[PDB]
Paper text:
In our studies we have focused on the periplasmic segment of [name] (historically called [name]) from [name], GspLperi, which consists of two domains: a membrane proximal domain (MPD) connected via a short linker to a ferredoxin-like domain (FLD). The inner-membrane bitopic protein [name] can be considered a central player in the T2SS because it appears to interact extensively with other components of the system. Even though the exact mode of secretion via T2SS has not been fully elucidated, the role of [name] is anticipated to help in linking adenosine triphosphate (ATP) hydrolysis to the assembly of the pseudopilus, which together constitute the two crucial steps in exoprotein transport. In this work we presented two distinct crystal structures of GspLfld, which in combination with the crystal structure of GspLfld from Vibrio parahaemolyticus, provide direct evidence for the conservation of a hydrophobic dimer interface.
The continuity of the strand β1 of crystal form 1 is compromised due to the adoption by Leu327 of two distinct conformations, with only one of them providing extension of the strand. The core of the dimer interaction interface of crystal form 1 of GspLfld is almost purely hydrophobic. On the α1 side, close to the N-terminus of the helix, the side chains of Leu306 and Ala313′ establish a heterotypic interaction which is complemented by Ile316′. On the opposite side of the interface another hydrophobic clamp is formed by Phe329, Leu327a′ and Val324′, the residues belonging to strand β1. The core of the interface is constituted by two interactions between symmetry related residues: the first involving Leu309 and the second involving b-conformers of Leu327 (bottom panel seen clockwise from top left). The distance between the main chain atoms of β1 and β1′ of crystal form 1 is in the range of 4.5–5.0 Å and is drastically greater than the equivalent interdomain in crystal form 2, which are instead within hydrogen bonding distances (2.8–3.0 Å). The electron density of the inter-strand region of crystal form 1 has revealed the presence of an ordered water molecule positioned halfway between the main chain nitrogen of Leu327 and the carbonyl oxygen of Phe329′ (red sphere). In this regard, crystal form 2 and the V. parahaemolyticus crystal form of GspLfld appear as closed versions of the dimer whereas crystal form 1 exploits a novel conformation, resulting in an open variant of the interface. Nevertheless, the GspLfld dimer is capable of subtle opening of the interface, which does not affect its hydrophobic core but perturbs extension of antiparallel β-sheet, as documented by crystal form 1.
Numbering used by the authors:
A (entry chain A), B (entry chain A): 303 to 382
Write the structure that this text describes.
Amino acid sequence: GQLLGLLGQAATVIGGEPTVSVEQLDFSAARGDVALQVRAPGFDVLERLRSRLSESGLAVQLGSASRDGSTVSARLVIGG
Amino acid sequence: GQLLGLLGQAATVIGGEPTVSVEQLDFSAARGDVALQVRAPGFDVLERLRSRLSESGLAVQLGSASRDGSTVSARLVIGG
Ligand SMILES: [Br-]
Ligand SMILES: [Br-]
Ligand SMILES: [Br-]
Ligand SMILES: [Br-]
Ligand SMILES: [Br-]
Ligand SMILES: [Br-]
């Protein structure tokens, strides 16, 4: 039982990004992962966030991205 | 936009409790709160966790508790 700590680290890293907002999350104790629906100004900020999460030791996948107006929405799955 | 940081602090505090497991959570960016379905050995551990969360500066409510076998299930709502 450590997954909520993973969301802790992700919370620090994502908190370090002013341009990113977390619209949704899907915490699955069964699957052993947590999904974050996040929004950013562009895809490069999203890749910066995935890189920072991966460098902090977390297993992270970034996908399901699409631009909607002035922002881009994507899914960051933390956990392995 | 600071609610995910609230889940960060709650993640530290709850991580400091070996007897407590987080079975569910309900992250509501709209309502400005997050709900945690947690399990513990007894109600006193639950009140210890609510007290530690409240003392760390978080607004927390503990309720909807019921014993089911050897453990007790309850709802901790963080956010105000
Ligand atoms: Br946010
Ligand atoms: Br871009
Ligand atoms: Br991980
Ligand atoms: Br846990
Ligand atoms: Br008790
Ligand atoms: Br709060």
